[model samples]
Target: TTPRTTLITGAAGGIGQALVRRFLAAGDRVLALDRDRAALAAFVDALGGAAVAPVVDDLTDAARLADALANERVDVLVANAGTAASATLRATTSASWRADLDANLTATYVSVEAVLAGMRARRRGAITIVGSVNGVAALGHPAYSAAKAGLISYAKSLAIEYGRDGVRANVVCPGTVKTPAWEARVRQNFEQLKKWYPLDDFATPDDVANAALFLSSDAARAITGAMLPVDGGLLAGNRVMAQELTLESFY
Candidate 1:
C-alpha cells in the first residue's frame, strides 16, 4: 500500500506547519503548499527530508496551481490559508473586503477545484477547511467572517455533490488561537481576551491541527459537512455574558 498524499496550503503559517508535521507523523506524504518560499523551504528542510514536499505557489490562481501539482495525487487537502486585513466593519474598505474574500474564501475554492477532479477520478478524498469562530458569530473582521461563513456552506455543498464520488468535506473553526496571527492582538490585551473563553486559555496551532487530522482520517468517515469547533469551548457559550446574566462567579 502506498502512503496517502496530503496537501496543506498556508504551510508556512503556525497552524499550517502544525498540520504538515502532524500529517507527516501520521505517515502521509505531505505536499506543504505556501507562497512563502523561504519559510516553506526552511521548515521542510528542518524536518530532514522525510516524506514532506514543499510546494511554493499562490492559491489565488487555480489553473496555475493545477498545473503545478499535475503530476501528484492529493488524497487529502487541508485548505488552511487565510488572513484578515480589517479588524472591524468600520475599518473595512472595498479593497480590504475584496482582499479578505480572496484570501479566506476564494483561495479555498481554488484549492478545492484543483483537487476535486482528481479525487472524483480516484473515488476517495477528504477536504478539511480551517474556518473561524467569527464565521459562526459576529465577533469582528466582517469580511473575513463572511468568507468563513461561506466556507461552511461551501463544505456542505461539496459534501452533497461529491458524496457519491467518495469525497468528504468539513470545517474546523478555531477561536483565539495563540498563533503569530494573533500575536499583536494578544500583546495588546492578553488577559482581557482570556476572560471571554470558557476554558480561559487560547488554543494552540497543534490543537487545530489535531482536529484537521481527525476530520481527514477514516475515523471520521461518516462525518462530512460538519463544523468542528477547536475553540476551547468559546462557542459553547459566552462566559462573561453568562456570569453577568446569572450574577454568579464563573471563576
Candidate 2:
C-alpha cells in the first residue's frame, strides 16, 4: 500500500497551498505544481520533502505538461492554478485575452486530458477544478469569466463522458477569496468587493481548500458533475446569488 497521491497544479497559489496541506494532513502524498520558483521551493521546504513533491512548469506547455502527467500515477488531480486579469479590456489589447485563454482554460484542457486516461484505466479518480463563482455568474474580466465558464461546462460534460469509468469530476465555485492574486484587486478596489459580496468579509484560501477535501473524499463519490459553491453565502442570496428562476416562471 503506497500512500495515495494527489496532484495539484498551481501549488504555489493560496488555494493550491491549502489543498496541499489538507491532503498531506490526511497522510496522502502530494505532487505540487507551480510556475513560481520561489513558491515551489517554499512548498518543498514547507512540506519537508517527505509528503510533498514540487514540480515547476508552465501548465500550458503540452509537451512538458504531458511529461509531468505521464511521470505520475495520481489518484487525485486538482487543477487549481488561475490567471488574474491585470489589464482591463478598455486599457488592454487582444493579447491579454489570448494569453489568459492559453494560461487558464487551454491549460486546464491540456492538463485534464493528460491525466484522464490514466485515471479511467484504474476506474478510481477524483478531478476537481477550482473554478470561480464568476464562472457560473460573472467576473468583470470577460476573458476570465468566459474561460471559467468554459471549465464549468467542461467538467460537467467530462462527468457525463467518463462517469462509467468511475472517474469523478466536479467544479468548485469559489466566491471572492482573498488570495495574493485577489488581494491586489482588493487593495485597488476595496469598495468593489463589498458591492458584490455583501458580508464585508473576504473568503480565505482555506475556505476553498476544505471544500476540495470534501469533494475528493469518498463522502462525495456520488457528487459528480456538481458546481459546488465554496463562497460564503455568495451563491445563496437573491441579490448576490443572482439566480432568478422563480417557481411561478415555470407556470
Candidate 3:
C-alpha cells in the first residue's frame, strides 16, 4: 500500500508545526511547505526532515506552487498559510488590507487550486482550512476577519462542488491560540484576556491542530463543509454574560 500523503503550508509556524507533528504521528508522509526557504529548510531539518519533503516557495505564486506539487498525489491539503494584522478597517491602509487578503484568502485558494485538479481526477481528497472566530464574531482586525470569513465560504463551495467526487472540505475556526505570533501579547496581558473566555484560558496550538487532524481523518468521513471551533466555547458566550446574569439574579 502506498503511504498516505499530506501537504501542509506554513509548516514552520506554531499551528503548522503542531499539525505536522500530529499528521506525522498518524502515519502520513508529510510535505511541509513554507515561504522562507532557508529558514524553512533549517526548521524542517531540526524537526527530523529526513522523513518529510520540505518545499520553500511563496504560496501566492500559482505557477510556482503548481510546479512544486507537480506529479505528486496529495491525499490531504491543509490551507493554513495566512497573515494577520492588528488593524481595523479605518486604520488599515490599502497596501495592508490587500496584503492580508492576499495572504489569508487568496493564497489559500491558490494552494487549493494547485492540488484540486489532481484530487478531482483521483476523486479522493481532504482539505482543511485554518479559519478564526474573527470570521464569525467581531474581532479587532477587520481585514483578517474578512479574509477568514471568505475562507469559510470558499471551503463550503469546494465541499459542495466536489462532494460527489469524494472530496471533503472543512474549516477549523480557532479562538486566540497561544501561537508564537501572539507570544508577546499573550505574555503581557494573558491574565486580562483570559478572563474574557468562558473557559478562562487561551487555546494552545495543539488544540487547533488536533481538530484539523480529526477533520482530515477517516473518523470524520461523514463531515464536510463544516466550521469546527477549537475555541474553548468562546463562541458560545463570553464570561461577561454569565457574570452579568449572576448579578441580575442577585439583584
Candidate 4:
C-alpha cells in the first residue's frame, strides 16, 4: 500500500511541527507548507528528512498553493496555519479583521477547495481544521475568535456536503495551547490565565497534535462534522481544579 499523503500548513510552528511528526510516525508522507522558508527547512532537517516534503508558501496565497498542489493528491489536509490577535471588538481595526479572516478562515476554505476535487474523485479524504476554544466561547481577540468560529462551521459544511464522496471533515478546538504563538500572552498573564482553566496547566502542542492525527486516521472513520476539544477541560466552563481542591473559603 502506498503511504498516505498529508499536507500541513504552518508546518514550522509548534503545533504544525507536532502534526507533521505525528503523521510521519503514522506512516504518512507529509507535505509541510509554511511561509517561513528557513525555519521550515530547519524543521525538516531536524526531523531527518523522512517522508516529509517542505513547501515554502504562505497559506493566504490560495492560487499559488492550488497551482503547486495541482499534480499532487492529498489524502489528509491539516489546515493549521493561522494568526493570533489580542484585540477586543472595540479595539480591532478593519485591517486586522480582514487579515484575520483572510489568514484563518478564507485561507482554510481555499486550501480545502484546492484538495476537495481530488478527494471527491478518489472518494476518500480526511480534513482537520485547527480551531481555537475562542471560536466556541468568548476568549478575547474578537476578530481572531470570529475567524476560528468560521472554521468550525466551514468544516461542518464540508463534512455534510462531501460525506457521500467519502470525504470527512472535522474541527479540533484547542484551549490555551502553550506554543510559541502564545509566548507573548503568557508573558503577560501566565498566572492569571491559570485560574480560568479547570486543568491548571495549559495544553502542549502534542495534545492538539494527537487529536489531529486521530481525526485524520481510519480509527475515526465513523466521525465527521465532529468538534473535538483538545482543550484541558477549558471549554467545560471556568473554575480551577486547584480552587476546588485547595481554596476552601466556602462550605
Candidate 5:
C-alpha cells in the first residue's frame, strides 16, 4: 500500500517511460527494464536522481533476466515490453514474424512466467499486460496485429490459469499513442492516419500509463482478464475516419 517496487518492462520507451514517472509520483519504487541502458540511465538522471532502477536487457534472454530478477521480488508486474514493425502478409518474412512474436508475444509469456511463481505462492499479485487496439480491430500491420491479437488471448488465458491462485492478470489496449517512436515512424509516412481516428487528437503515453497504474492498483482489485482500452474513442466510432471522405472537409 505504501511504496511498492513494481517492475516495468520496456521502461525506456513510450508508455513504459510514462509509467515510470506515474508510478514514482504515486509513491512507488520502479525497476525500469529496457534494451537501452544509456537511455534508461539518462531518463533516471533527468528525473532529478535515481528514483528508478534500470534493467537493460532485451527480453528474449531469459537466463540473463532470471539473474536480473534474482535479487528482486516484484509486487506488481507491468509487462510493457513490445515491438510493432509493420509488414504486409506477402511481405512478412520468417524473421519479421519471429521478431513480432518474440517481442510482443513470447516476451510476455516469459515475463508472466517470471512473476507467476512468487505471486502464486503468496496467492496475491497483479499483472497488467500492455496490449494494442490492433488486437481487437484492424491496424493494417500484419505481423504486429497478429502478435497483439495473441496478447489479448494470452492475457485471458493467464487470468484463467492464475486467477484461481489469487493472482490477477489483465491487458490494456491502447490506440496509436503519440510516443517518440510512433511519431517518428508514422507521422510523415502515413499522413492519412488521422482520417481513421475518431478523436480530436491522438493519445499520449501518460494516458496509457494512468490506465496501467489503475489496473495494477488495488482499486481495480476485482478486475482480471479484462481489456480496458484508453484509445480516445478510436474504436468506439468509425465516422471520424471512414474511407468516404470529402476533399472539401480538409481544404
Candidate 6:
C-alpha cells in the first residue's frame, strides 16, 4: 500500500510540531498546515528537507483549503488547530466568544468538511481532534472551553453519522501541557499549577501527540466517539480537594 497522507492543522505550534513528527515517524506523508507562514517555513526547514509538506492558510477558510487539496487524498486529519481568547467570563466578550468558536470549533468543522467526501468515498479514515481538559471540566477560558466542549459533541456526531462509511472520530484532551502558550503562567506559578494535577506534572506535547497518533492509527480502529484525556490525571479527582477534605498530605 502507498503511504497514508496525514494533514495536521496548527502544524507549527508545540503540539502541532510533535504531531507532525510522530506521523512522519510512522511512515506517513504529512501535510503541515498552519497560518503562520514564517513559523511553518522555519519548522519545515529545520527538518532540513521536504519530508513534510507545508500548507499556509487560515483553517476556517474552507474554499481555499478545498482547492489546495483537491487532487490529494487525506487519509487522516488531526484537527489540532485551536487557541484560547479570554481566561474568564468577565474577560470574554462577544467577539472573543465568536473568535474562540471560530478558531477551535468552526475550524475543525471546516477541516473535516474539506476532507469528508474523500474519506467517505474511499470508505476509510480517522479523525483525531486535539481538545482540552477544560472541555470536560470548567478550568477557565470560558469561550475556549465551550468551543472545545462543542468539539467533543461534534466528534461524536461525526462518529455516529459516518461509522458505516468506515470513518472514525475521537478527541484527545490535554491539561496544562508544557507548551509555549503556557510559558508566562509557568514562569509565574509553575508549582501552583502542578498542585492541581494528581500527577503533579504537566503533560508534554509529545504525550498529547502520542495519544493522537494512537487514536488515528489502526490500533484504535474500534475506538470512535471517545474522549481520551491525556491530562496527567487532572480529571480523575481534585487532589488538593481530597487532601483538604481528608486532612491528609497528598503531597
Residue runs of model 1 more than 4 Å from their true location after superposition: 180-189
lDDT of 5 by residue, 160-239 (tens): 88889988888999887889888889755755666666666678999999999999998998999999988877778676
- The residue-by-residue lDDT of candidate 2 on 98-158, one tens digit each, is 7777777888887787677788889989999998877776546767877889998898998
TM-score, candidate 3, is 0.93
In model 6, which regions exceed 4 Å deviation?
A: 180-189
lDDT of 3 by residue, 139-181 (tens): 7798999999999999999999999999999999999788887
lDDT of 5: 0.82
lDDT of candidate 5 at residue 65, scale 0 to 100: 77
All models, RMSD in angstroms: 1.5, 4.7, 2.2, 2.9, 3.0, 1.4
Error of 4 at 44 (Å): 1.2
Q: What is the per-residue lDDT of model 4 for residues 38-111, given as tens digits with 9 covering 90 to 100?
A: 99989989999699998888766667787898868899999999877556888788888898888889979878
Tell me the deviation in Å of residue 210 in model 3: 0.7
Cα lDDT of candidate 3 equals: 0.87
Can you write out model 1's per-residue Cα lDDT over 1-251, one digit (the tens) per residue?
Answer: 99999999999998998899999999999999999999987998899988988889888788888888898999999999998889988899999999999999999999999888999999999999999999999898899999999999999999999999999999999998878767776676668778888888889999999999999999999999999999989888888888899999895
For model 1, how big is the CA root-mean-square deviation?
1.5
Pairs with steric clashes in candidate 5: 195-241
Worst 10-residue lDDT window, candidate 2? 242-251
Q: lDDT by residue for model 6 over 1-251, one digit each (tens)?
A: 98899999999999999899989989889999999999998999987674689999898778789789987899999999999999999998999999999999999999998888899999999999999999999989999999999999999999999999999999999998888767766776567678888887889999999999999999999999999999899999888899999999997
TM-score of each: 0.96, 0.86, 0.93, 0.91, 0.89, 0.96
The lDDT-based order of candidates, best leading, equals 1, 6, 4, 3, 5, 2
lDDT (C-alpha) at residue 176 in model 3: 79
Could you tell me the TM-score of candidate 5? Answer: 0.89
Off by over 4 Å in 3: 181-189, 248-251
